[PDB]
Amino acid sequence: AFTFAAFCYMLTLVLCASLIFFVIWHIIAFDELRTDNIERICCLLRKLVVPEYSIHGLFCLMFLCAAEWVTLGLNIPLLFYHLWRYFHRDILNYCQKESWCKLAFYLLSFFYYLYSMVYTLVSF
Amino acid sequence: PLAYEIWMCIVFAYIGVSVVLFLVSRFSNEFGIFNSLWFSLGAFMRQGCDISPRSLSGRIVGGVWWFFTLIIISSYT
């Protein structure tokens, strides 16, 4: 059919794809620092992390007004991790493991919107 | 004239178009998170926009959003 939650699941597919490029550009920046100017590698990382956290804030806000609380539970723990980084503002091995999980989490949830949206459109 | 389900869809589409235009203007005209909201607001209210997107991937968002606010306003009237 046509519901407000069905349209919210459609905007996520276009927006979550942009969040994929951020975590992919992150592992590239960490790969360059592992091989080795150093200011440009970290200052750019500070500029890319802010939109990634703000865009996900809409994912927790769109589904809140869409009454789809079954999907919100799959995004609340992701937003809680952003509060730890925002509060406090070797490290290479720790941050590397803290970024590979982002690519897997932003991809497994990406397939949900590709299927949960179909579960409402064709189900008219 | 417009159901309450459409008014909730317009606001999130307005912000959704705005955040995409900011992401398009980031991979490369400033078009920050603030100027994109102003340009999209001036385009939805049929007013004269201050600036226009320079890149092709930014011009697509402008032309598509222009067709969106034209159909919605014409349907509301």
Binding site: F7, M10, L11, V14, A17, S18, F21 | C9, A13, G16, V17, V20, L23, V24, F27, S28, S55, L56, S57, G58, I60, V61, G63, V64, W65, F67, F68, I71, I72
Partner: peptide, 24 residues
Amino acid sequence: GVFYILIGGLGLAMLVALIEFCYK
């Protein structure tokens, strides 16, 4: 239909931005 057109335009713009970023 206009919402579908909006979503398709956003997706096409994202793809064109990806292409133009990978062009360099």
